[PDB]
Amino acid sequence: DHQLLRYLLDKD
Amino acid sequence: DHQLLRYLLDKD
Amino acid sequence: HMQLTAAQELMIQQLVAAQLQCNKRSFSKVTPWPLSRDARQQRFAHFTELAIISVQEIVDFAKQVPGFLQLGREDQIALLKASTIEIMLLETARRYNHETECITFLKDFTYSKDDFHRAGLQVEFINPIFEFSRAMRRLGLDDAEYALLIAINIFSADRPNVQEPGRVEALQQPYVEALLSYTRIKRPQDQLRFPRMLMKLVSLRTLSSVHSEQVFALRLQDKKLPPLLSEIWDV
Amino acid sequence: QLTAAQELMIQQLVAAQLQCNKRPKVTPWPLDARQQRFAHFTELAIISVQEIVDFAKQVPGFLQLGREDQIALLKASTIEIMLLETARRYNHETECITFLKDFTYSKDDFHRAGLQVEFINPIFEFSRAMRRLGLDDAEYALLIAINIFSADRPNVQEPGRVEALQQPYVEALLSYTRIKRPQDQLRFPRMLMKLVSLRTLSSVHSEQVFALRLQDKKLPPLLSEIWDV
Ligand SMILES: CN(c1ccc(C(O)(C(F)(F)F)C(F)(F)F)cc1)S(=O)(=O)c1ccccc1
Ligand SMILES: CN(c1ccc(C(O)(C(F)(F)F)C(F)(F)F)cc1)S(=O)(=O)c1ccccc1
Ligand SMILES: [Ca+2]
Ligand SMILES: [Ca+2]
Ligand SMILES: [Ca+2]
Ligand SMILES: [Ca+2]
Ligand SMILES: [Ca+2]
Ligand SMILES: [Ca+2]
Ligand SMILES: [Ca+2]
User: Fold this and answer.
1) Helices C6-27 & C143-154 angle (0-180, nearest 10)
2) What are phi and psi of C159, to 5 degrees?
3) How far is it, in rounded angstroms, from Cα C92 to Cα C138?
4) What is the CATH classification number for the domain harbouring D103?
5) D152, D176, D210: which to substitute to probe chain C, counting the most C Cβ within 10 Å?
6) Taking the mean position of all CA atoms in its chain, how far away is CA B5?
7) What is the residue with the minimal CA distance to atom 23 of ligand 2?
């Protein structure tokens, strides 16, 4: 759920 | 419109 | 910074006295609470009748806030339609018992989450009500701060279909200033009390949106609001 | 008289936020025609969501939150922070909002994309009003930080911690406004009152989204997860 936020948060 | 309300405001 | 002006001190006492008054006239009878598909509809009727009582008290008090009736009748309507549910939630918080998590709506009758639920309300509304009531008690407002916050909430130029925003924002100032001076004096070491209180106006605004959704969810469920409430909340 | 930390922390916020405004390709605006416009917007939204998260990660304290609260706070404040950024890029002489580096949009362009006045107008009312208060970089930065750390967002697990994180940003905003204009004491309140308006705007935005559900318009799955019912 909330893949956009989860991806953006993990990114880097 | 808003009859019962218009009443409450008018009381007294 | 140590003492209020007499104009501010006066303003506060009139609001506090007005609120006390409107709450006494509130004392002076609804569908009883069922101790079944009729029982289901009756509990709802019960709630709606408590809500009617609240609205009446709220209109009564707003009429006694100086400057409210000096506004266009139409803007009076607009501000009340927006205000009512938020001021109700403030007064519900004022009846909340944090130890057992119930709200006392009459004298010795207490309502719990399951009680709210047995009246047809949905948990997505119920829990945010208890959440806010809980947060409010952390803040521990006294009579003067409650009365001012409600004055301030009423005079929100923000509201839908307000014709004269500037009048409204002009009325709100002295009440905002009074709250600001009052908190510095009574609680000089807590520099954030004024901000925390305003923050509650933010919460109430979301809560208003949650209530609308409750009202809408009641339609799809064959439950309609009584005339006064409908007048105020239906679309 | 801001503390040494406060003054620095505020510079780092503004830095962060500038670096995000500066730090891309979208479905070009038409000259089907209706749908290309809608998509164009949803892609602007997707891009700002990305800047906003990028900013959040740099707001001190934010990463002390568990992941689920990071999610919960951003899910709620995303649209609200967006409307702040829009408001901040509103040209009053032209009455248009300028979006990346060059793009300009009128109250009518928004109408062409498929948005409704119930939502379009209040956005411009808010952009106008945001202009009256006249905020500088530092104020927008703190205001955004304050919006993010709202303990009352749905599904927050550590409300106490979130409020404690919001606190220092409120202090810094309070002082800043007591100095930049020691004249107006009601400037601080009036700024916070905008946070109130943002909650109502967020609500109106959701209706706008529900609306599109019938008007045969839908958003990418990634935005859909953030805004749908
Ligand atoms: C804020 N709450 C509330 C307000 C309105 C409604 C309703 O509007 C609806 F359920 F439809 F949403 C109705 F109709 F019951 F009043 C239901 C609940 S309350 O339970 O704290 C409360 C009830 C009575 C009096 C004062 C406060
Ligand atoms: C706040 N506005 C907005 C946000 C979301 C949507 C939508 O969510 C919907 F129309 F569905 F409501 C969508 F889908 F277009 F993104 C529509 C409009 S905006 O135009 O000022 C803006 C767009 C992009 C970036 C920053 C601000
Ligand atoms: Ca009252
Ligand atoms: Ca509990
Ligand atoms: Ca009972
Ligand atoms: Ca309980
Ligand atoms: Ca019980
Ligand atoms: Ca940003
Ligand atoms: Ca243009």
Assistant:
1) 90
2) -75, 160
3) 14
4) 1.10.565.10
5) D152
6) 4
7) D45
